[PDB]
Design a protein around this ligand. Structure first.
Ligand SMILES: OC[C@H]1O[C@H](O[C@H]2[C@H](O)[C@@H](O)[C@@H](O[C@H]3[C@H](O)[C@@H](O)[C@@H](O[C@H]4[C@H](O)[C@@H](O)[C@@H](O)O[C@@H]4CO)O[C@@H]3CO)O[C@@H]2CO)[C@H](O)[C@@H](O)[C@@H]1O
Ligand SMILES: [Ca+2]
Ligand SMILES: [Ca+2]
Length: 418
């Protein structure tokens, strides 16, 4: 496991990671208080599957609850009230056991952190920041969903639970928890939630202070039309928006440019995500996924969230693409362990590792066939990927001797290696 910073100093940790999203949205409802036990027990399996890192749920206890019609939720970690680890995924002790087991198996532990807001109204909590001291967004005049003097980012819904993450004392509080997580809970890095809510620069700051050499990824989910008309972003591509965040936070960023193309374009348009970018300084910072806990489905109740779910007929092609191309791929717990895509994903992980494909590997797209046809220059091997294509043989688009590596869905998914 190679470990540096990118050439622009972005925290991609060698650019050779393969991450497992370690949970689905209904875990707290389906395996109440047992998730850490399940992970401790799966640790060897996950390591054997080829993951180099796992994205753990929010460790901070969440006893929240809500309902709007048929919809109900709460306790998943996104509306935490304390830094206490005895929440709905399991106890502090189980967490330590789980992180120990994962780390011992060679999988780095990445924790999901939610600095933007907290469950302010929760009666029994260890963290109580009063009003009028500038700890909250609403301590200032809050026009709308725009930075105010008490919060330099967007707000979460109403903005009444929004923290002034820039207050010396709030910054300090997060900083110390990050360090705690690294020193006692074996953190190998962090997944930053709702990065639209606070300054990118603060993420670099927190990283610099607590885990400068660790892995980090930020979730920036905000399309051009969400910015003000006078903002250069209102007219930028999804690629430029996410890239700009990454340049400032100095952390890889989730490839929402590829996600939007997966959802709105055709397979041929997949080449427009951040990871297909011809400049390696651009593609190397992409963190690709097919679905997450918000965008995809989840076992159990309401099918989970499914805000922007990829249709089952493109799941295999979607994974074939992310596992074989540039950027850093993330595999959804569910596709891997619930829905039976496991065997397929294992093959691809193996293909990616054999070819020596990395965050900055080169990718070329071939225009003359249907579907998506790409040439990936792995460090050990070259791969030809043809998805929903009429391509006949790898030699039509590349020079060299190719063997078939993957052939699934009646040829809708084909991968060859040199
Ligand atoms: O006090 C603040 C606000 O509190 C109340 O808001 C509720 C919402 O109505 C609920 O729908 C819910 O919100 C969830 C949300 O459903 C879910 O997507 C999730 O979103 C995360 C997401 O996982 C993450 O990956 C990324 O996109 O950031 C999001 C926020 O972190 O989690 C939310 C929080 O659990 O819960 C809140 C609070 O219970 C109230 O209705 C509002 O008026 C009020 O302003
Ligand atoms: Ca690495
Ligand atoms: Ca905010």
């Amino acid at each position: 496991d190679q470990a540096g910073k990118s050439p622009n100093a972005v925290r991609y940790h060698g650019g050779d990671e393969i991450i497992l999203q370690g949970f689905h949205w209904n875990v707290v409802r389906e395996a109440p208080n047992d998730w850490y036990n399940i992970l401790r027990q799966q640790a060897a399996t996950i390591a054997a599957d080829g993951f180099s890192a796992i994205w753990m749920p929010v460790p901070w206890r969440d006893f929240s609850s809500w309902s709007d019609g048929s919809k109900s939720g709460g306790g998943e970690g996104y509306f935490w009230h304390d830094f206490n680890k005895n929440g709905r995924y399991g106890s502090d002790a189980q967490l330590r056991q789980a992180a120990s087991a994962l780390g011992g198996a060679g999988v780095k532990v990445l924790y999901d952190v939610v600095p933007n807001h907290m469950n302010r109204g929760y009666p029994d909590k260890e963290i109580n920041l009063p009003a009028g001291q500038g700890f909250w967004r609403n301590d200032c005049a809050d026009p709308g969903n725009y930075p105010n003097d008490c919060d330099d980012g967007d707000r979460f819904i109403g903005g009444d639970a929004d923290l002034n993450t820039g207050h010396p004392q709030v910054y300090g509080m997060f900083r110390d928890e990050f360090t705690n997580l690294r020193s006692q809970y074996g953190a190998g890095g962090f997944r930053f939630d709702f990065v639209r809510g606070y300054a990118p620069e603060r993420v670099n700051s927190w990283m610099t202070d607590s885990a400068d050499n660790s892995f980090c990824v930020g979730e920036l989910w905000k399309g051009p039309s969400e910015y003000p008309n006078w903002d250069w972003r209102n007219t930028a591509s999804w690629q430029q928006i996410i890239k700009d965040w990454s340049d400032r936070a100095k952390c890889p960023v989730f490839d929402f440019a590829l996600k939007e193309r997966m959802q709105n374009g055709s397979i041929a348009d997949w080449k427009h995500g951040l990871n297909g970018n011809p400049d390696p300084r651009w593609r190397e910072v992409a963190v690709t996924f097919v679905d997450n806990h918000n965008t995809g489905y989840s076992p159990g109740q309401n099918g989970g969230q499914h805000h922007w779910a990829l249709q089952d007929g493109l799941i295999r092609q979607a994974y074939a693409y992310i596992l074989t191309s540039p950027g850093t791929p993330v595999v959804y717990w569910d596709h891997m362990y619930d829905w039976g895509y496991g065997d397929f994903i294992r093959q691809l992980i193996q293909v990616r590792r054999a070819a020596g494909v990395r965050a900055d590997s080169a990718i070329s797209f071939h225009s003359g066939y249907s579907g998506l046809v790409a040439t990936v220059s792995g460090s050990q091997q070259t791969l030809v990927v043809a998805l929903n294509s009429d391509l006949g043989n790898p030699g039509q688009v590349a020079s060299g001797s190719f063997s078939e590596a993957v052939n699934a869905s009646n040829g809708q998914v084909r991968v060859w290696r040199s």
